[PDB]
Design a protein around this ligand. Structure first.
Ligand code: ATP
Ligand code: CA
Length: 360
């Protein structure tokens, strides 16, 4: 039968069928229970009477009962499949604990009775989707941003870097600075509008201070945005101040290094034998890398940090919002991969620890 691919993130589930070019189901990774459980948009609609929780925090599954609900809902309600009929590829964060990976495996086989499964590293899937087995991935999602250097298909765990800021932070920051302008974006409905502004109108400046001067000197950078009630507002320097936070986390009160410095710092940790290959194969992935201008800015920033003679390249695939999912879709469809699934029989004999002998 067809394999399933489920890429569970902190903010969004991306799920579908291996061989498709995109996930069929993309929905909020949220479970609501009375203040008898509800998922995603149905939980958000009932937030007045439910306590909402996110079962994945910074990519890691932290609430297992709620994750079981997400997975059940995904199979039965979003995909409308019988999970016992389909091999299922799941994804994991960088540095996912062994015990976590084993528990995911056990749930798949014991709670959902899947015939087979696999767990792949999200960054490896994105690198693979880009046509590479060596490079360094910058994966910026809704909750977390990571740098994952990968050599000949293997993630280098000693050199993974984390930045505890991503898309939900940028949405909230945009609300804040738009409010400072004189608007009022404060309510949860107002958050949804601002996520839309963010995804439609924001961009990364090549030179932040130059761009500030331009925005303050003229209207050349302003855009209008029609609100749900029909009211038209103007977005100016907020277009690029919002994603500047990726490069300057101090904008939201964080002391952490920005994404250019985490990229550089990750590379430095890797064997000097492979540094030249990482610099020439920086691959962007995840929703929060979607800003226009981000590759150009990274290129400039890493150039400043690295030795002057280093060849540096930033690859930002058009389809990078879902490249984790797409890599999973391709991989699960390959003839060669079919020997790699962990089968129910194999799990029955070896137990959950079989999952660690994985090549993705
Ligand atoms: N075009 C866009 N421009 C800017 N941000 C975007 C765009 N599209 C999506 N995003 C943001 O990307 C985030 C979702 O990305 P993604 O699905 O990669 O995250 P995730 O897997 O849910 O989270 P994480 O990887 O942090 O666990 C949201 O915050 C969303 O607003
Ligand atoms: Ca993700």
């Amino acid at each position: 039968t067809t394999a399933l691919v489920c890429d569970n993130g902190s903010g969004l589930v991306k799920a579908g069928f291996a061989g498709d070019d995109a996930p069929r189901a993309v929905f909020p990774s949220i479970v609501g229970r009375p203040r008898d459980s509800y998922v995603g948009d149905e939980a958000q609609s009932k937030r007045g009477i439910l306590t909402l929780k996110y079962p994945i925090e910074h990519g890691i599954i932290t609430n297992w009962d709620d994750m079981e609900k997400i997975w059940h809902h995904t199979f039965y309600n979003e995909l409308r499949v019988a999970p016992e009929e389909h091999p299922t590829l799941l994804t994991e964060a960088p540095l996912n604990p062994k015990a976590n990976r084993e528990k995911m495996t056990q749930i798949m086989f014991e709670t959902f009775n899947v015939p087979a499964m696999y767990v792949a590293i999200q960054a490896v899937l994105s690198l693979y989707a880009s046509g590479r087995t060596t490079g360094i991935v910058l994966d910026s999602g809704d909750g977390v941003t990571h740098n994952v250097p990968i050599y000949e298909g293997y993630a280098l765990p000693h050199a993974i870097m984390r930045l505890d800021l991503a898309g939900r932070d940028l949405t909230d920051y945009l609300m804040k600075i738009l409010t400072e302008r004189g608007y009022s974006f404060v309510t949860t409905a107002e958050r949804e509008i601002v996520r839309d502004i963010k995804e439609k109108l924001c961009y990364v400046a090549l030179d932040f201070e130059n761009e500030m001067a331009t925005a303050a000197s003229s209207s050349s950078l302003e855009k209008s945005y029609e609100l749900p009630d029909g009211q038209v507002i103007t977005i100016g320097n907020e277009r690029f101040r919002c994603p500047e936070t990726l490069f300057q986390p101090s904008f939201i009160g964080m002391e952490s290094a920005g994404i250019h410095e985490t990229t550089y710092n990750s590379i430095m940790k890797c064997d000097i034998d492979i540094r030249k290959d990482l610099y020439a194969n920086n691959v962007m992935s995840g929703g929060t890398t979607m800003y226009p201008g981000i590759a150009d800015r990274m290129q400039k920033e890493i150039t400043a940090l690295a030795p002057s003679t280093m060849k540096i390249k930033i690859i930002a695939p058009p389809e990078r919002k879902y490249s984790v999912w797409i890599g999973g879709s391709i991989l699960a469809s390959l003839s060669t991969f079919q020997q790699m699934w962990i089968t129910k029989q194999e799990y029955d004999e070896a137990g959950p620890s079989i999952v660690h002998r994985k090549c993705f």
